Amino acid sequence: GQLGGEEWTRHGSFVNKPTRGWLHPNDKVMGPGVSYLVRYMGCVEVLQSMRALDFNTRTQVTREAISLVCEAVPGAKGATRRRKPCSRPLSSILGRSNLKFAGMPITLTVSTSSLNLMAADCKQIIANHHMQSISFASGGDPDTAEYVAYVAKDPVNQRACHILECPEGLAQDVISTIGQAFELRFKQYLR
Amino acid sequence: RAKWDTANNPLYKEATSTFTNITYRGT
């Protein structure tokens, strides 16, 4: 028989007004949510977490994704094409690099308890609208500032690193925005 | 053992800043 399955309807906006006297980003992150232009470029399935990973290892596994992705899959503005064909991802520390989802326009949407990406491809909304279910985010202004990444609980895998192309500044922007947005209720007891 | 990384080559080496906040792991 067939008794229940999945109802595919993702709709749940957070509405709460203590005030609206915020600044441009804050207004949205607390209300609708700020939006940045990003490009889905590859995805790496990581079966591990920061809790479980080494200080360099977690940076390596994240950069790995961004690395072999940008140096192999389409979208990257700078590649020399170097992929280890039949080998391990980095040290088989995580799952594996899956260069399948590359070349899809999306939108980094930051929200109080949500961090989802809207497919500008007019497909739908991806990622998860749940702050408590994220993990990594590579960005800021490093070597990799030209290619951004975020690792969260994946709709397919347990966790996945999703690399964003064409940041235009989204790197440091989303990092600062998401961080400081959540920081509005950030306790000093942890992190 | 003390190298620096677990392994490195054209595909894979650490080089970037990846983190978020206190959601999954207080690091």
- Rounded CA gap, A190 and A124, in Å? 35
Q: Do B20 and A138 lie within an 8 Å CB cutoff?
A: no
Phi and psi at residue A68, in whole multiples of 5°? -65, -25
Q: Which of A125, A174, A119 is nearest to A182 (CA)?
A: A174
In the block, which residue shows the tokens 């232009």?
A37
DSSP state of B4: S
What is the bridge-based pairing of β-strands A96-111 and A148-152?
A: unpaired
> Chain A neighbours among B 1-27 (CB < 8 Å)?
4-27
Go through chain B and list every residue after which a break occurs, taking a C to next N gap over 2.5 angstroms, comma-separated: none
Interface test with B, best of A29, A57, A63, A146 (most B CBs within 10 A): A63
- Hey, which residues does A118 pair with through a beta bridge? A107, A125
A177 in Cβ contact with A142 (< 8 Å) = no
Domains of chain A: 1-191 (2.30.29.30)
Measure CB to CB from residue A50 to each of B10, B15, B27 and give the nearest one: B27
The alpha-carbon gap from B23 to the nearest alpha carbon of chain A, in Å, equals 5
A178 neighbourhood in chain B, CB within 8 Å: 20-21
**Helix, strand, coil tally for chain B in percent (to 5):** 0, 10, 90
> Is there a contact between A103 and A163 (Cβ–Cβ < 8 Å)?
no
3-state SS, chain A, equals: CCCCCCCCCCCCCCCCCCCCCCCHHHHHHHCCCEEEEEEEEEEEECCCCCCCCCHHHHHHHHHHHHHHHHCCCCCCCCCCCCCCCCCCCCCCCCCEEEEEEEEEEEEEEEECCEEEEEECCCCCEEEECCHHHEEEEECCCCCCCCCEEEEECCCCCCCEEEEEECCCCHHHHHHHHHHHHHHCCCCCCCC
Closest CA to A81 of A73, A67, A90, A71: A71
